[PDB]
Amino acid sequence: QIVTDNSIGNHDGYDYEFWKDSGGSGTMILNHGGTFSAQWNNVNNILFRKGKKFNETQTHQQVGNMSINYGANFQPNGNAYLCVYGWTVDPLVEYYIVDSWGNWRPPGATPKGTITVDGGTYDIYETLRVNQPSIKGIATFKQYWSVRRSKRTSGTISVSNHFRAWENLGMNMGKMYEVALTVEGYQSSGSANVYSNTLRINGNPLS
Ligand SMILES: O[C@@H]1[C@@H](O)[C@H](O)OC[C@H]1O
Structure with missing residues (x-):
């Protein structure tokens, strides 16, 4: 359950990925349920995550309401993100709901809109x-x-609300490939202890 190189699998019901x-190094310790710890040093790009991978046949509406309750002790030294992350296919889209970051608030572009949700x-x-x-x-x-x-490092992320806000702005979404609580680092070092991470789909926790 020690992962220090690229790996995709399922651990305690969650689809995990390193x-x-x-360049550099990282260590991910797979813990109970959706939980895990991460440590990285002098990386170019690294991602650690636990969530759900899907079979690329359903829209987010078809999958259902997605909500993640989490908590993490996030200690980045440099550029890193604490977020919900995933992809869609057809079209191929990489997505982020960022609750905390290190020295740099991403993503460097001009905002296209705002969403109020989850008290933020x-x-x-x-x-x-x-x-x-x-x-x-x-x-x-x-x-x-x-x-x-x-910044915040615990709470609930109403994932499907963000997807509806994005689609409202014409940010087209494809079929779901993944949704997961993720720590990403870029040209940085750090640690993160994700001590709480439950994905509920239509209110039902993953198992
Ligand atoms: O899962 C990996 C993704 O998250 C990373 O951004 O780049 C390529 C993918 O294989």
Whole structure:
């Protein structure tokens, strides 16, 4: 249950993933349910996550209401994100709902709107990745973001509310590939202890 190199699997009912490119190091310890701990040092790009991977046949509406209750002790040294993350396919989209970050509030673009949800106010952004690694090969795809205005590291993220706000703004979503509580680092080091992470789909916790 010690993962220090790329790996995709299921642990205690959650689909876990460790992903990095070359350079630096990371260690992910898979703990009960949706929980896990992460440590990274001098990485180029690293992601740690536990959630649900889907079979690419359903819209988020078809999957149902998605909500994540979480808690994490997040200690980044540099650029890193504490978020809900995932992808859609057809179209291929990488998405983020960011509740905390390190020294840099992402994602560097001009906001396209705002959403109020879960007692916070999030700025909404759309960015473009060109010929970058993805879940479907080296590709050019959009990234969708909701970024909280101030940091928090525990609470509930009403994931489906963000998806409806994005679609309201014309940020087209495809079939669901994944939704997961994620820690991402970029050119940084840090630690994160995700001590609470429950994904409920139509109110039912994952198992
Ligand atoms: O799962 C990995 C993704 O999250 C990362 O961003 O880049 C490529 C994918 O394989």
